[PDB]
Amino acid sequence: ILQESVLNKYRTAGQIAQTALKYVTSLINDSYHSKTTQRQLTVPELCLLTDSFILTRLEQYYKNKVNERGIAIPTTIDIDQISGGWCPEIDDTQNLLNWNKGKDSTFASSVTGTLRPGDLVKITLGVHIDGYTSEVSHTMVIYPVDETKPILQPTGPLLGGKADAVAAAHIAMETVVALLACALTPEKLPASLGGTSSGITGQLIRTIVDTIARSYNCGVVPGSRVRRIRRFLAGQNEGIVAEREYKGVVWTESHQEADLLSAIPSDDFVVQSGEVYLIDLKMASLEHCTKKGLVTLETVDSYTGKSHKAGELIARPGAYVRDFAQTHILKLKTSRQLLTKIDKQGVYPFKLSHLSSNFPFVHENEEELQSLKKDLKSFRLGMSEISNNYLCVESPIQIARWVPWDHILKATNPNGNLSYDATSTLTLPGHELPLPKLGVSAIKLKSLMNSTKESISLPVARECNTIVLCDSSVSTTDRPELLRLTGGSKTCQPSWIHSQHELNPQDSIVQGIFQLATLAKDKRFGLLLKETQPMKQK
Amino acid sequence: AMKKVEDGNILVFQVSMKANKYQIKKAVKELYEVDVLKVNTLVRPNGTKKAYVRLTADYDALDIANRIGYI
Amino acid sequence: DVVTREYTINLHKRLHGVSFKKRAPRAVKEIKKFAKLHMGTDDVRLAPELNQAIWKRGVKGVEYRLRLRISRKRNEEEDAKNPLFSYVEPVLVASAKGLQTVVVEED
Amino acid sequence: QNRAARKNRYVERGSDVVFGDQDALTASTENGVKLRQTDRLLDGVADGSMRSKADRMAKMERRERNRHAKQGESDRHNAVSLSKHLFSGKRGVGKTDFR
Amino acid sequence: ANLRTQKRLAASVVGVGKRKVWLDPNETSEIAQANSRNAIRKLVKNGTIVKKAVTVHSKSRT
Amino acid sequence: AGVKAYELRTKSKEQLASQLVDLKKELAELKVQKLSRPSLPKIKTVRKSIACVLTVINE
Amino acid sequence: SSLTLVKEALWSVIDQGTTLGGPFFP
Amino acid sequence: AAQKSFRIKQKMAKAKKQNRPLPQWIRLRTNNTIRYNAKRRNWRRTKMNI
RNA sequence: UUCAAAUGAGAACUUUGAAGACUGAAGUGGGGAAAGGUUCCACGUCAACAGCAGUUGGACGUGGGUUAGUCGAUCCUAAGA
Ligand SMILES: [Mg+2]
Ligand SMILES: [Mg+2]
Ligand SMILES: [Mg+2]
Ligand SMILES: [Mg+2]
Ligand SMILES: [Mg+2]
Ligand SMILES: [Mg+2]
Ligand SMILES: [Mg+2]
């Protein structure tokens, strides 16, 4: 039930998220683009600084008036093929170097922590106040610096499949925002898009997103979703923790199979007023795919001995999820104190460094960082016994992978539907049917991906916003309108890209998309979007 | 075994059946660059030898555990 | 039908001639049979304090007369084969002599 | 008592909202093992379909020994065909082999 | 539930025989969660586990 | 993969000793990983590499 | 067979531009 | 006995390591005929005789 | 031996509590020697075994556990070899 206090909490969370995104963008620009800073910051340092900034900002709001507040989604920096889960800790730099010695240079940016020109950096972070969660995610491009131009500007725009992915993600984000804002004014929906008397449907969402992706020659990564957000139920760990009820549209390998052949989420809903929606879209480029293939995900482990592949990434996830349905008394006093600290976080993923007493740092000092690492050692000692008794689980690091359909069709599975992963610790991904019609399980699909010689990794671009459908009493101007709590032209400003693809204006869906854009730009007789502003610091 | 890491600055190793306490202490000091307070040993009922290695107070066994990789 | 009465049971004539190791268990069974006869319920439950009153003087020292409160109540569980059951309680009194069957006003 | 009851207030939290009715979140192992505990019996069979097939094969294999009422695969007691101490008797007027 | 282990641990921790430890019949789940002597000590502290007094052997007639 | 004896035979004593030490360190790390992951195929090739280096040195 | 029909259908079915942003660092 | 010789303890360690049923992946091999451990030992059934 | 509750498809036999008894310090208590060899302890768990039963087990499946300059062996010699 939307109300004044709920709206204020959502707005405050969105403002803090926007300010944090501006802070990380400024730090990355000053380290790699402006190059005025003496020292280039690395990815774990940027993540730690982001989390400290978020905590210091959130300290001043709703103090002793809200039971639970903090970081909802820990800061994540995903580069290219990595599509999520990359939040490495500061005590793992040498571990990453030792683990990935003797490998290829494909994941060199993630291994070293230093960004390189031509990289797609996806920054994701979220903030919750009293269970009301606002999350933002934005893709940006790293550019080389021109030496002759008086002002710091890129030498040239991004070109190719990465540009295709960024353009597809940006345009799909804007189009979905406009379509969802059209739910409050059902009379402004174009006839070509759908019924004038009809509302907004998950089928319409799916066909618009798929039309944009197919027009830009990109695939929707199976992590993407457009869903509804409630209190403490924001999909902060969607593939891990099961939810009783789901109202949204998701994309999977099963959906790819259905398109090619043309608790459970279903695209058979109607968007209602007074609701909060999360839109996370990941587009993977298909530039190097000479055939028709399937987009899926690969999990990264920390075992260098499982294979001989030189292009393999070996890493350890940095974020953990607490399972409050499981209880087991630990033998270690360190483990018991760590679990006491973990239970204070709540139902959101957390980092080990977030549990330290030093964090967040007030005066950033080398001695403070040393005390933080000293705490991290004992935290890892406690976490070893915590995870071994299934009290907490890891959020996996994932890479987008492309598998051709001919290999899948030629393959044989003697078990079919019956097979599943019996050694999988997590329940939800262990029992999975990525291809229900072909009867191919997740373990069989992983076998196919490993056995295929032409299974490649696709660069991914991400855009994720949070919106609220404010009614007449909820909104200020006495008419319903869309409030974008995170993202917009100020924080999520698109990078300099150029792509050779475009929407074809001869399609009914494309014409509907263009009419949505025009009606959104019409600020008098069109749609009304209010964008949350990042607060000043200095 | 992991309890002793915090309880008494003790690392627990599986060692060769042909090794004595002198060899175990020397091997630990060479491999991990730490000082060893003392070494206790036993033969397990499965036939392998276990060594409790207590380090001096100048070194933390927790750091060595983190460096080895198990934690 | 929910009801509650107080009775006197004569265990002396019921345990007349019983072997000494079996007197208190047979008193338990005779009380169950007594409650079944008076209430029409196959499901009879004895209070542990009543069991203490039976066994107070050992295996062969059962009292001649006992004052009991028997309550026929509804069985809330659906899986039970019966809708009603009896619950037998002890009535600790000055003496169990000269007492008649009475109806307890439940409130 | 009223002051104590008003002091003892139950306030719901995010854990009650999210994990209040659910359970599990972890694939319960067949042998009750910890996360980093070896399973001598099942580590070589990755998928549960083949695990169940192997289990059915073992259960079918056990039937003859179970019909012979053995304590297990380790029960290999052998009885002799005939016992000489029971079939070596001519009882004279004197000492016997048993009472 | 099976509280045999908890009964033995409570006897050892309190320092009396198993005949002298009382486990609350209503806190069955709380006692069942206690797998360590530390948790047993906590239960003794909060009163779920109680030490019984010795059976008297009076010397008055003697 | 692993190492090849004909490629090892072109190196000197100090290089072979250094390679043997590096292989033994890698084997120790793999034995650490084995405690959590029971199936680890790289152990076999590291052990065979160590045996091959020892054979070349002795030759 | 339904699996055969699905596999046959899958085999039968598989067998300017745009510019965003500008010369600046946001 | 508690105070045992090392030779006896070594044989005991070998017997302990031998005490197991078959691994399940053995049953799935091509042309497998090993269907149970026919040499399994139990402490209360067959004595080791030193 | 009895009562109630819990667990469980199922409870005379399992767990807790409530009772009644017994070993009565030359014990049905607490430790060891010979011998056994993991039977110790935890988790899972009932096809076979525990001459009834069984949710229980010294059973079945998977693991954990035995830390010495001072306790022994090791050294000395006895009858002897
Ligand atoms: Mg010793
Ligand atoms: Mg008679
Ligand atoms: Mg007597
Ligand atoms: Mg007596
Ligand atoms: Mg029987
Ligand atoms: Mg036992
Ligand atoms: Mg056993």
DSSP class per residue in A137-184: EEEEE--PBPSSSSS--BSS-EESHHHHHHHHHHHHHHHHHHHHHTTS
Q: How far apart are CA B18 and CA G21, in angstroms?
A: 70
> Which residues in chain A have their CB less than 8 angstroms from residue G11's CB?
409
Bases of chain I with protein Cβ within 7 A: 1-7, 10, 14-21, 32-39, 41-45, 47-49, 56-68, 72
Phi, psi of A296 (to 5 degrees): -145, -170
CA A186 to each of CA A160, A177, D40, F6, F7: distance values in angstroms, whole numbers, following the listed order:
38, 14, 63, 77, 74
Paired tokens of A278 = 């999360």
For residue F8, the CA-to-ligand 4 centroid distance in Å is 86
Q: How many CA atoms lie within 13 A of B19 on its CB side?
A: 20
**Beta partners for F20?**
none
> Looking up tokens 């998220």, which residue turns up?
A17
G5 in contact with A at a CB cutoff of 8 Å?
Answer: no
**Cα separations (Å) of E42 from A336, A382, E18, E36?**
14, 21, 18, 10
Amino acid at residue number B57: A
CB burial readout H8-46, b (16+ within 10 A) else e: eeeeebeeeeeeeebbbbebeeeeeeeeebeebbeeeee
Number of Cβ atoms within 10 Å of the Cβ of A372: 21
Nearest to A284 by CA among A344, A325, A202, A223: A223
Contacts of C1 (CB under 8 A, 6+ apart): C72, C84
Instruction: Provide the 8-state DSSP code for E34.
Output: -
Q: Is the CB of H14 under 7 A from strand I?
A: no
Which position has the token pair 């000091």? B29
**CA-closest candidate to residue A240, choices A326, A299, A322:** A322
Report d(CA A275, CA A247) in Å as an integer.
Answer: 11
Report the distance separating Cα G17 and Cα G22, nearest Å. Answer: 15
**Residues 6 or more apart from A300 whose CB is under 8 A from it?**
A85, A313, A314, A315, A317, A396, A397, A398, A399
Residues of chain E positioned with their CB less than 8 A from the CB of A329: 33-36, 38-39
H42 alpha carbon – ligand 7 mean position (Å):
10
Neighbours of C48 (CB within 10 A): 8
Using a CB-CB distance cutoff of 8 angstroms, which residues of chain B are in contact with residue F35?
70
- SS3 annotation, chain C: CCEEEEEEEEHHHHCCCCCHHHHHHHHHHHHHHHHHHHHCCCCEEECHHHHHHHHCCCCCCCCCEEEEEEEEEECCCCCCCCCEEEEEEECCCCCCCCCCCEECCCC
B6 touches chain A (CB under 8 A): yes
Which residues in chain H have Cβ-Cβ distances shorter than 8 Å to D62? 36
- Where does residue C98 fall: left (phi above 0), alpha (psi -120 to 50 degrees), or beta otherwise? left
Pairing relationship of beta strands A481-484 and A529-531 according to DSSP bridges: parallel
Q: What are chain F's partners, defined as 3 or more CB pairs within 8 angstroms?
A: A, B, D
Report how far apart, in Å, the C-alpha atoms of A511 and of each of A171, A182, A519, C69, G16 are.
Answer: 14, 16, 12, 85, 18
The residue assigned the tokens 């019609």 is: A437
d(CA A450, CA A444): 10
Beta A350-351 vs A319-322: how paired, if at all?
antiparallel
Amino acid letter for position C7: Y
Dihedral sign, Cα of residue A257, residue A262, residue A266, residue A270: positive
Nucleotide nearest to E2 (CA to C1'): I15
Do B35 and B58 form a contact (C-beta atoms < 8 A)?
yes
Whether residue D23 lies within 8 A of chain F, CB to CB, comes out as no
Three-state secondary structure call for residue A354: helix
How would you classify residue B61: left for phi > 0, otherwise alpha for psi between -120 and 50, otherwise beta?
alpha
Q: How far apart are CA D88 and CA A491, in angstroms?
A: 105
Q: How far apart are CA B25 and CA A56, in angstroms?
A: 48
Which own/partner contact pairs does A418-424 have at CB distance under 8 Å and 24+ positions apart?
A418/D49, A419/A443, A419/A444, A419/D47, A419/D48, A419/D49, A419/D50, A420/D47, A420/D48, A420/D49, A421/D46, A421/D47, A421/D48, A422/D27, A422/D42, A422/D45, A422/D46, A422/D47, A422/D48, A422/D51, A423/D46, A424/D27
Asked if E36 has any chain A CB less than 8 Å from its own CB, the reply is yes
Burial of A178 from C-beta contacts in 10 A (0-12 / 13-18 / 19+): buried
The number of residues making up chain D comes to 99
Judge contact between F33 and A305, C-beta under 8 A.
Answer: yes
The token pair at A56 is 């210091």
Q: How far is CA F57 from CA D1, F3, F20, F21, in A?
A: 87, 14, 10, 13
Measuring CA to CA, how many Å separate A114 from each of A44, A77, A297, B71?
10, 12, 25, 27
Strand partners, A406: none
Distance (Å, whole) CA A503 – CA A356:
50
H or E, element range at A112: helix A108-112
Contact between A434 and A296 (Cβ < 8 Å): yes
E24 CA to centre of ligand 4 in angstroms: 30
Cα–Cα distance measured from residue B39 to residue B26, given in angstroms and rounded to the nearest whole number: 11
CA distance A281 to A167: 12
In a domain, C104, yes or no: no
Dist CA A126 CA A14 (whole Å): 8
Rounded CA-CA distance H14/H11 in Å is 5
HSE at residue E14, side-chain half, CA atoms within 13 A, is 26
Quote the minimal CA–CA distance from A354 to chain G in Å: 29
Task: Check if the beta carbon of residue B34 is closer than 8 Å to that of residue B28.
Answer: yes
Distance CA A207, CA A205 (A): 6
Task: Count how many residues are written for chain G.
Answer: 26
DSSP single-letter state for residue B56: P
For ligand 2, an ion, list residues with CB under 5 A: C 17
Return the number of CB contacts < 8 Å for D and H: 48
Q: Give a yes or no: residue C46 inside a domain.
A: yes
Strand I–CB D58 distance below 7 A: no
Residue C54 is assigned to a structural domain of this protein:
yes
- Indicate if CB(H4) is under 7 A from strand I: yes
| Separation in Å, CA D72 to CA C64, D5, D65 | 56, 59, 8
Total of domains in chain C:
1
Residue C107 lies in a domain: no
Smallest CA-to-CA distance from A461 within A207, A227, A160, A258 is with A160
Q: Determine whether the interchain pair H24/D51 forms a contact, defined as Cβ–Cβ distance below 8 Å.
A: yes
DSSP tag of A270: B
Q: Where are the alpha helices (DSSP H) in chain F?
A: 5-8, 13-34, 42-58
Q: Give the H or E element holding residue B27.
A: helix B21-32
Rounded distance, CA C65 to CA C98, Å?
A: 10
In window 15-54 of E, residues with CB < 7 A from nucleic chain I are: 21-25, 28, 35
Please list, in sequence order, all residues whose beta carbon lies within 8 angstroms of the beta carbon of residue C37, skipping any fewer than 6 positions away: none
Radius of gyration of chain C (CA): 14
Contacts of A215 (CB under 8 A, 6+ apart): A168, A501, A502, A503, A504, A510
Residue E17 has, within 13 A of its CA and on its CB side, a CA count of 5
Q: Is A437 helix (H, G, I), strand (E, B) or coil?
A: coil
Nearest to A411 by CA among A383, A438, A429: A438
- Paired sense of beta strands A398-404 and A82-84, if any: antiparallel
Tokens representing residue G24 in the block: 């600046």
Does at least one atom of strand I sit less than 7 Å from the CB of D38? yes
Bond before A480 cis per omega within 30 degrees = no
The three-state secondary structure class of A190 is coil
Question: Does residue A83 sit in helix, strand or coil?
Answer: strand
Cβ atoms of residues F26 and F46 within 8 Å: yes
Running DSSP on this structure, what letter comes out for residue G1? -
Q: Which of E9, E30, E35 to probe by mutation at the A interface, max A CB count within 10 Å?
A: E35
Euclidean distance between CA atoms A394 and A401, whole angstroms: 21
Q: C-alpha distances in angstroms, A247 versus A289, A429, G26?
A: 34, 20, 35
Q: In what order do the strands lie in the sheet with B49-55?
A: B10-15, B49-55, B36-43
The type of residue at A322 is R
Buried b (16+ CB within 10 A) or exposed e, E21-50: bebeeebeeebeebeeeebbbebbeeebbe
User: How far apart are alpha carbons A96 and A109 in whole angstroms?
Assistant: 11
User: Which string of DSSP letters, residue by residue, matches A4-53?
Assistant: HHHHHHHHHHHHHHHHHHHHHHHHHIIIIIS--SSSPPPHHHHHHHHHHH
Distance in angstroms: CA A313, C1' I54:
54
Q: How far apart are CA A383 and CA A91, in angstroms?
A: 14
Through-space distance between the first and last CA atoms of chain B, rounded to whole angstroms: 11
Residues of B in contact with F32 (CB under 8 A): 68-70
How many interface pairs between A and E have CB atoms less than 8 angstroms apart? 9
Among protein residues, the one whose C-alpha sits closest to the C1' atom of I41 is E5
CA atom of H44 to C1′ atom of I75, Å: 40
The shortest CB-CB distance from A501 to any of G13, G17, G23 is to G17
Per the entry, the structure determination technique was cryo-EM
Q: Which residues pair with A158 in a beta bridge?
A: A497
User: What phi, psi does E2 have (nearest 5°)?
Assistant: -130, 105
Structure tokens at A143: 């550019």
Residue A180's nearest CA partner among A253, A264, A265, A247 is: A247
CA distance F33 to chain A (A): 6
In this structure, are residues C72 and C39 in contact, taking their beta carbons and an 8 Å threshold? yes
Select from A388, A283, A279, A408 the least CA-distant residue to A331.
Answer: A388
E24 CA to I23 C1', in Å?
28
Q: Rounded CA gap, A393 and D95, in Å?
A: 79
Query: A452 is written with which tokens?
Result: 């295929």
What is the rounded distance in angstroms from the CA atom of residue A272 to the CA atom of residue A58?
Answer: 31
What's the residue count for chain C?
Answer: 107
Residue type, A432: E
Best CA proximity match to A304, nearest among B31, B69, B62, F53: B69
Helix or strand run (H / E) with residue A80: none
How far from chain centre, in Å, is Cα D3? 53
A328: tokens are 């087991």
Find the D85 Cα to ligand 7 centroid distance in Å: 38
Contacts by A360-366 with C-beta closer than 8 Å and gap 24+?
A360/A51, A360/A52, A360/A53, A360/A55, A360/A56, A361/A52
Strand pairing class (C44-46; C84-90): parallel
DSSP reduced 3-state for A73: strand
Tokens describing residue A389? 């008794």
Residue pair A391/A339 in contact by the 8 Å Cβ criterion: yes
Which residues have C-beta within 8 Å of that of residue D69, sequence separation ≥ 6?
none
Phi first, then psi: what are they for H36, rounded to 5°? -165, 165
Domain segments of chain F as ranges:
1-59
Which domain does C64 fall in, by range?
A: 6-96
Report the run of H or E that residue H36 belongs to, with start and end. Answer: none
Positions of E strands within A293-379:
293-299, 319-322, 350-351
Q: Are strands E49-51 and E21-23 parallel, antiparallel or unpaired?
A: antiparallel
Rounded distance from Cα A230 to ligand 4 centre (Å): 70
Structure tokens that stand for A388 in this block: 């071994």
How many angstroms does the Cα of residue A441 sit away from the middle of ligand 3?
Answer: 71
Q: How far is CA A194 from CA A512, A533, C41, in A?
A: 9, 33, 69
Distance in Å from the first CA to the final CA of chain F? 22
> Do the Cβ atoms of B45 and H13 come within 8 Å?
yes
Residue C103 lies in a domain: no
The identity of residue A296, as a single letter, is T
**Domains detected in chain E:** 3-51 (1.10.1650.10)
Provide the token pair at B71. 């934690």
The reply to whether the CB atom of residue D78 sits less than 7 A from any atom in nucleic acid chain I is no
Question: Which has the closest alpha carbon to A495: A172, A37, A119?
Answer: A119
Q: Which residue type, as a one-letter code, is found at position E15?
A: G
Given resolution (angstroms): 2.3
Task: Identify the sign of the CA torsion E54, E57, E59, E61.
Answer: positive
Give the C-alpha separation, A67 to A78, whole Å. Answer: 32
Phi and psi at residue A293, to the nearest 5°? -140, 180
Nearest nucleotide to C48 (CA to C1') is: I3
Contact (CB<8Å) B71/A385: no
Q: What does the DSSP 8-state code read for residue A495? A: P
Please say whether the beta carbons of A279 and A467 come within 8 A.
yes
Inside any domain, residue C37 = yes
